[PDB]
């Protein structure tokens, strides 16, 4: 599923991401835009052999099991394919664990490079929330 901007904002808000660990909703929407272009089916392979999955590009090196990343952990205790669902529940629940781990949203390279320090409120502007 390819979400609309406001559609995703509302789904994320419903799932408790607004101001989660101090990160306003606009941060999460911005991250999803540049990580996956709002596409729940996005996948990308990394140099080390791990793969990033879903709307928030969660990495199989640490967070999910895809059966092909030897010596990796599965800290979210889920198969990576669960992160590709049209239902964003699994992605959100895992993102909450990631953002709580000490490094905040800096875990997401696109957030650090393209959202951090910008006017992220612009990403939820006009939305019915």
Provide the minimum distance between the beta carbon of 104 and Cl ion in the complex, in angstroms, as a whole number. Answer: 3
Q: 7, 18, 48, 52: which one is catalytic?
A: 52
Residue 104 within binding range of Cl ion, rule CB under 5 A? yes
Contacts of 74 (CB under 8 A, 6+ apart): 63, 64, 65
Question: What is the rounded radius of gyration, in angstroms, for the C-alpha atoms of the chain?
Answer: 14
Q: 35, 66, 87, 119: which one is catalytic?
A: 35
Provide the minimum distance between the beta carbon of 71 and Cl ion in the complex, in angstroms, as a whole number. Answer: 28
The stretch near Cl ion (CB under 5 A) out of 10-18, 65-73, 79-87, 99-107 is 99-107
The stretch near Cl ion (CB under 5 A) out of 26-34, 38-46, 70-78, 104-112 is 104-112
Closest CA to 8 of 19, 31, 21, 22: 31
Closest CA to 88 of 7, 9, 11: 11
């Amino acid at each position: 599923k390819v979400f609309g901007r406001c559609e995703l904002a509302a789904a994320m808000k419903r799932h408790g991401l607004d101001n989660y660990r101090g990160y306003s909703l606009g941060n999460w929407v911005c991250a999803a835009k540049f990580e996956s272009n709002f596409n729940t089916q996005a996948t990308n392979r990394n140099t080390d052999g791990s793969t990033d999955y879903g709307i928030l590009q969660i990495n199989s090196r640490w967070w999910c099991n895809d059966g092909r990343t030897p010596g990796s952990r599965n800290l979210c205790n889920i198969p990576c394919s669960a992160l590709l669902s049209s239902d964003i529940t699994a992605s959100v629940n895992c993102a909450k664990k990631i953002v709580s781990d000490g490094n905040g949203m800096n875990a997401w390279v696109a957030w650090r490079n393209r959202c951090k320090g910008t006017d992220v409120q612009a990403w939820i502007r006009g939305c019915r929330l």
